[model samples]
Structure formats: C-alpha cells, structure tokens
Target chain A: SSPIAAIFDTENLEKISITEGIERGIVDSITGQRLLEAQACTGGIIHPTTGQKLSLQDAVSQGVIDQDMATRLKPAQKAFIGFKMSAAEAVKEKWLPYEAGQRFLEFQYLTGGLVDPEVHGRISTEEAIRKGFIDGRAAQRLQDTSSYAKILTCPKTKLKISYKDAINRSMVEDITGLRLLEAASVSSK
Target chain B: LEESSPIAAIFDTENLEKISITEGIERGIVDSITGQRLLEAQACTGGIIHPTTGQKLSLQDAVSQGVIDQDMATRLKPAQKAFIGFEGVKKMSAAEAVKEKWLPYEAGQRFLEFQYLTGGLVDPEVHGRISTEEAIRKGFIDGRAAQRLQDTSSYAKILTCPKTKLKISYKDAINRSMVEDITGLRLLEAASV
Candidate 1:
C-alpha cells in the first residue's frame, strides 16, 4: 500500500467532457502533464483551483522553489556526466587488455580449437598472442591481412600446401611425436 | 602388355592378393616408369586434432575407420601426456592442481586424456577401464582410484549404476577384450546369463 495515495485495483477508465467553437480568435490546447487545457466552454467544467503547468525551471522562476534549492539540484543532476567518463576510461585501458588476455587463456585452456578447415592445426603461439585465437577479431585481422590471409583461402588445384604454408605442412608428422619447440618465443614478439 | 611390364598382372586378382600373404612384401608397388611407390599413407594426412597438445593426430579417424582399436586411440598421445610431465613421481588431481598454479599443469579441459573419462565414471557404463581385480594384478592404477569408487560419496547419487539383471551395451561387448584375466566363456556368462 502506498502511504501517499489509496492503491486502486479496479478495472475502470474515466472520461472528461469538452466543447465550444470560436471563429475570429482561434486557439489550441497546449496542456500536458503539469498543464491544464483551455477553450471557450459551452458548459465544459474546469476546477477553479487547478492552474497551468509548471516546469521545474518555471517553478523556480515562479518562486515555487527558492534559489538555494535550485543551485543544489543542478550539481546533483550533472553528477552522472563524470561517472560516464570514468567508465569509458576503465573499458579502454583496463578492461580491453584483461579481456584480451583472458580470451587467449580460454583458447589455451578450455576450448578444443573449433576452427576451419574444421580439423587439424592448433593456433600458433605467435598467432595466439597477436590475434588471440583463430576464433575472433584477433584472428579476423590477420585473416584479412595480405601475408596470413592466404591460409584462410582454399588452396589451388593441387589441394596441397604451398612453400609459405607453415601450418598445413606441420600436420604431416605424428602429433604424439612432434613437440611445440617454440610455443612462445621472445623473437617472435 | 609385355610380361616385363610392371603392372602386367593387374587383371590377375588372385595372384595380386597373394604376394607373400603373411610375411611382408611391400603393401604397395613401384610404378616402373615413374619409379615411385603409388599408395600414399593416409596417416600423414590431417584429421582430428589431439585436444590437449593441440597437435593434428589421426587416432580418432583411425579408430573410426577400423584401422586401429580404441585402446590405442584413446590413450593420451605422448606429446599431450608430456604437458603433465612424463615420468612424474605421481599423477596429481589435474583439476585441483591446475587451480593451484602448479608447475607443469594448468586448469584446462584439454588435459582430460580420455574424452569419455567423465562418462565412464558417472554412467552405468560398467567401466572395464579401471577395476579393483585388474588393478591388483597388473598394478596399472593404485588403491586410491578403487577407494574413490567404493566411497561414492561425491557423485554417486547421479551415477547410472551397474547392470542389475545381467545386461550390457554392444559397446561393452566389443571392448570386453580389454578386461584382464577373463576368458570368453566367463565374460559371456557375466554379461548375458
């Protein structure tokens, strides 16, 4: 229950009546939430005490709110502006890099390397650090680039790897026998 | 074609089939003109990758193709096993060890050697993989693994459970060869009637 007003649950709608036409002096109602409509009444009713709408600014100017209260209100309303700027700064510097590192860590740990040509080939360590993984924007950037882009395209008639294709060439050996000799290297960075 | 031609007997299917049938003649032949072995080995080609070390391996493909049995296919590849450190004093709980940031291990699913290890433990899958009787004889696993099964304090409530009235999946029958110290007659009796 609301303390300020009775909570009514009745399914009913109310209506108000209006009328009157004027010829030479034409006008339109500009009433909204805090305002009241006006027209020449044939017999349309208006409460004698209800007045025109008053905006917060208009209320202050009309002495409904004093100057000291208006001054305090302005500063509190603008407080959200500073908060939005701080959130943007945090996203760019702290959040992006942490998210990027964690993204690679997820590929390194959790994922089973779901990628095309649907099977074979682990994300290279250099590729993992630079593109993060072959699953997202980090990969798309490299895939869109000139040198690495060839790997993503279907190979020529032979359907075999090219001289430059280090990836497909690596899969020929037994996976159990091969070692990741340079999973991470300083020079590659 | 002349008798001297390399593939002259190509139409003689029976002769082609019997070239040192049991003792090894080369399974493939050299083309006389090209002087090259014709049948390329399929193992060299790319297939399913090992989940851990992320190396391209054909163990799954070979198993599916009936070229290799499940025991060899499911065993962790030497490269993948090396990540946990081969020849270690003991096998640590991979999940717990990874969370601790312990050396030679990390928190990851790829480290699960057998992809079906979870199913084996929880499902009514009558796991022949680890059994108390077999463990005592072969020393393949220690007492702890058997103890964990007996305790059943953790995930026991969710287990599919053992066969109640002598029944088995076809999978259990095919893999029955893996069970130690058991003959065919004993296996059939335990499994069916």
Candidate 2:
C-alpha cells in the first residue's frame, strides 16, 4: 500500500516549487511551454495501437503497471516536466521505453508469469495450466474456487468439457462456447 | 481561482496553497481552544452541575442557593443513577470474533475437519474420501490448530460414544441432522477439558 501511495504521489503536480525551479539550471520558459503542449497534443501522446488516452492511474488499476515502475517513472515524469521536456522526447531519448519496460516487468512479476485473470477472464485458464500454474486436480478444484470458471467445448468434437479440462487436454478453449452451443440447439431450419 | 504552477511560477502562490498558510493556522488555534474546554469538562469530579440553573453545587446546597425547590432536589438526588463499569462488553476484533463464534475449542476444529474430509468427493466402494491431508489444506484452520485436536474426536464420535463404542448405522448417519443433535448437548459440557 505504501508503494501504491508513492506511485500516485509522483503525479501530484502540486509539489513543484518556484524556489527549486531557479535552484536548478531550468530551461527557457517558452521552450518548456511548447514541449508541454506538444506532449499533450502529439500522436505519441495517446496509445500507439488503440489511440486511447492513458494515464498512470488507469494503467495501475488495469494491472498494466505496478508500484516499482510507478516509483521509477516518478523521477522520470518529474524531470520531464522540470526540464521542460515531453514524453515522446523521453522515448526518443530512450528513457521512456526503459521505464515503460520496467512497468511491464512489474506487471509480469506480480501475475507470476500467468496471464492476469482480471485482464483475460476465462481465457486465462489454459495459459495458466500450460505455464504449470495448476495440475489436473488443482484445475478441478479451481472450478469451485474461481468464479470465472466456464463450461467450454471442443471446436471440432462439439463435446462439452470444463474450461479447465479443455485447457488441460490442449483443446481450443475460447469464448465462442456459449454461441456454438446455442447454434447447435437450433436444429435444421 | 487556484494557482497554476507556470503562472504562479514567478509569484510563489503555489507555496502558500501547499501549506494552506491562512486556513491551516486558523484551524490550529480553534482546535487548541476547543480541546482545552473539553479537557476541563471531563476533569470535574467534586461538584455536580444543576441541569436547570447550570450551577455546580450539592443537592442540599442547590436548594440553599435558591436554584430549585427542596422537593425537586430530593427527587433529583434519588432518581439520578451512578455510572459504573462500561456501557457493554468491548467490541471483539475479527480474529477474536472468529475464535469465539466458530473455532471455540478443539472439538469444533476436529468436527469441521471430519465433515470437510468425509462429506466430499470420496468413493464409497473403497471407503476413500478426500484425504486428511487434502482436507487440512482446504479447511480454514492450519496444521498447528489441527494438531491439538484428538484424532478420534468429531461429531461422529458424539454419536458412537454412547457408553459403549457403538457403530453408527448408515441410515442414521444419512438421516441425522448434526445441527439438531449438537444443539441438544450442553456445548460447555461437550467441549473437551
């Protein structure tokens, strides 16, 4: 929880002091303003693929970022704003991807090498098994424990099986199980 | 309006907002004054304040002070209840509550473990139930707690230990309600010494 507090504390723009601005060799005020503006407006500012707005808060909740990366990025984002630099400029400067990769490593570490259940839902079961997170009996026991467990079926055989079993048997376990079952229930029209 | 870093950059208004220079100091003074009066109110042990006249004095003295009638003072003195002890029992923490309400003794821990192991996916043909090891892992109690309970002790033992070590009938085992039977025993008596 302390780590979480420290992470969000980085974004608390309320901490910057005027005395400290002059104490360090600050950049030109006009240059700083342009960088801040371009950083917000430019294409790289949004997510590269989805083109959605991203914030540190959103990433943490979604499990995309963890406390370690948040702590590392605190100084990174602070220096970016302090030096009158932009996020893209940090990436071009190689510091952005390095800090971003640290965030990814933190997420992977916390998830214990399995796809995160909160992110992937039922689809994570097979990956969990293949990654040796659980064996057959362990997978069977998870049926009672995990609320996300679903009754899935084989793609070719159309035989019904537990999502865990499908994953265990190397069967294609997808979200299309319910739809296929519904289609099968509707006889020749 | 709130100060932005860049504009208030030159003026240092951000420093004042961070410390809340005006509001912070005002609240500190007000809080200290309120705390002093509260401390004095709780400290008074010698005299009782008359609720009506708000004068601190004895009941007989209050009457002499001409604050109330003699009959009113007599009535007030007898009716007022002296405070003793606490209002009720102290609220139990979650761990304390769990110990009190659920696993109060060795017998309860044993019975729950028995039920957990025997009542699950076990084969009747071989009399194979979920292993004790598996049940221990699954149960709310850990190995240290379970180690204290007797191996022979359980709800099943209660039925079988009727003077002689009699075997419980299969039909009775299925039909008998543990809750109804257990409630009949004085739990304090039934619990191991």
Candidate 3:
C-alpha cells in the first residue's frame, strides 16, 4: 500500500503547505510527474529511436511528453516506441521496420503504442501488428507480471522461445540481447 | 498579489466576518443596558438575557456567563432547537450509513476473493478458475487442454458451452458476468478486499 497519510494528508496546515508547493514543480517535467505518480519505473527503456539510455527521471519526462502528444494523435497508428536493443550489440541490427525510431511515431500518433487500450481498440488488429504496436500474445499478456518491468531488452539468439517460459528468459534475446543485458549491468560493473 | 492568488484575500474576508459579527453583538449589548429594548418581537424567536440581572444580553454574554442551557449553548440551529452541547458532534453523510453496514461484509467477500486469487495460484478448484481459463485461452495450453476442458460436462454446464468454449470466450474485461454466474460469487466483493 502507498503511504496513506503522505498520499492524502491534507487534514493539517503544514503538510498541505508542503504538498501544494512541491506538486507544481514535480508536474512540469514529464518524467518527474511519472516518478511522483509511480508510473515511471527507473533503470530500463529510454528513447525509442535514439538508442540512448535514460535515468528514471529523464525517461519519465520524455514518456510524459510523448504520451501527451500521443493523446492528441489517434490510436490506429500508435506503436510502442521504447524497445531497447541488447547492451551486448549495435542498435541498427535490432531495428525492426516498425520500431520506435522509424514507424513508432505513427503508432504513437495512432494507438499511442498500446498505452491506452481504448485507442488501440479503434485500430485494426492487422494494422496494429503491421505497425509493430504489439504481437497478439503481447496484447493478450498485458495483464501478466512481465508488464511491470520498466525496461525490456532482449538478446540475439536462434532458439525458439516457448510462450510459457519466455518472460523468465528474454523477450529481446538475439545478438542484441547480449549487449543490452551488458548495458543493463553497466551500473553494477 | 496577482488576480489568481486570491486565497489569502478569501481567508481575510472570512476572518473579518467572524470578528464583525462578535463585535457588533458586544456593542449592541452595551447599548441595551438602559432597559430600552434594542430589538424585540413577540413571536417564537430565541434570544439571550443575562442571569441574575435579568438584563437582556447578547448570545455571547449569555454563553460566557452560563446563563444559556447546556443544550442551547452548543446548539447550532435555534430554529430546530437542536442542542448538541459542545462535547459531542458528528459528521454525517448519505454514504456513511451504507458503508458502515457493508464494511464487515467486504471482509467476508475478500476471504472469498483470496480463495480465488490464491486458489488460481495453487489448486484449480480452490482458487483461480478464471485465471486458469484465461491462461488456457491465451494458448498457454495446447489443443488437448482446450478440448478436455470443453468436453467436461460440468465445465461446459457452468460456462454454457459452444459460445463460451471459443478461443476468445473468456476475458476479464468482458466475461465477468459469465464467471460470476458460474461461480455464484460477486466479483466486486472480491475486489473490495
């Protein structure tokens, strides 16, 4: 549970004064607002096209701005832009035709990258798949535990992944998966 | 201050209202000391008068001197004659009564909900039937799993077969009623816990 008192402690004067003051500053930045709201998870996916890693705060700021723009855009086109290449490889190799840098902006404008199912539903499933908004299995598993991760990077590999165990293994496994995990481990190393 | 920052002014205005009301009554009390009725009417209206002196007093003076009855001193509405004395006050709203009645029932509902979430996590009958169906529908299980479950008479009976056995038959977003009707459990009651 969240801090019940801290989340909703406007009963007294002092706490109200502090909360009101901080709330405005926090909302100005996209990522900052996400952090405060518990919507942005740190240490994972960053920019869709740039292949740049970002802090929790910076990633959130970009995501918020992107989502804000995406809100005005239609869902029929929105694609998930933030797929990370393996820390173990070059981003160019992992760039699918519909990835964040290329076709994702259209998806962002269309389905908002499946962030909002209401909008995603407006588009055709084939359109969503063609745009790389999501695979059917991914769309189905939105409620699963894997959805909770802030960043998702896969490896470059040839082995076929079974639906039952892929989440425990790597969604991004390929030559790209190796480098991405290496990048993810950049902090620890 | 900017036109938008008017909260400070609002507070000042409220303070002035309270102070003005009290001071005006105190001034009127002083003026009425000479036995001339400053304000009076014959109909049903409540007012204060000083104890012992029987000198007409303001509400504040009557309250301070203990001349007002225990009930009247704290009572907010003289029109209603509701004496709620200073010691006891209550907050009431329409939902409060309903929520109070349902609060304990929600606990019972949660016990049943956990029976589902954890049951889904563990045994098939004990908990997660909905989750199990969901898992199967998502192709987590092969054709045999779907066929076996679909062929079972009780499973088919509970979910009403054919239409429900389709690959897309079950969904948390849409098929809630199907689950509840089958399980005879109120899903929201589970959510409350």
State the lDDT at A80 in candidate 2: 24
Question: For each candidate, what is the lDDT?
Answer: 0.22, 0.26, 0.24
Model 3: per-residue Cα lDDT at residue A130: 56
For candidate 3, report its TM-score. Answer: 0.19
The regions of model 3 sitting more than 4 angstroms off are A1-38, A41-126, A131-189, B1-143, B146-193
Evaluate model 1 with DockQ and give the value: 0.00
| Candidate closest to the true structure, highest lDDT | 2
DockQ for every model comes to: 0.00, 0.01, 0.01
Ranking of all candidate structures by their lDDT, best first: 2, 3, 1
RMSD of each: 29.9, 29.9, 26.7
C-alpha lDDT (0 to 100) for residue A188 of candidate 3: 19
Worst 10 residues of 1 chain B by lDDT: B1-10
iRMSD values, candidates in order: 24.2, 26.2, 22.6
Cα lDDT tens digits for candidate 3, B1-193: 0000000000012222211111222333112211111111000012342322324344555557654433443332221111111111242111121234422332222221221222121111111112333334433334554344333222211111111222221122123222123322211101100
lDDT of 1 by residue, B1-193 (tens): 0000011011112232211100111222212211100000011112222212223335565456433345544432332232222233354332233334442332122221221121111001111111232333334334664454333222112111121222332222223212113211111111111
Score residue A120 of candidate 3 by CA lDDT.
23
Q: Write the per-residue lDDT of candidate 1 for residues A23-88, one digit (tens) a residue.
A: 111101111110111100001112211222233354356543334433433322111122132111
lDDT of 2 by residue, B89-112 (tens): 342211122355532343233233
Candidate 1: where is the Cα deviation over 4 Å?
A1-189, B1-64, B67-77, B83-87, B90-193
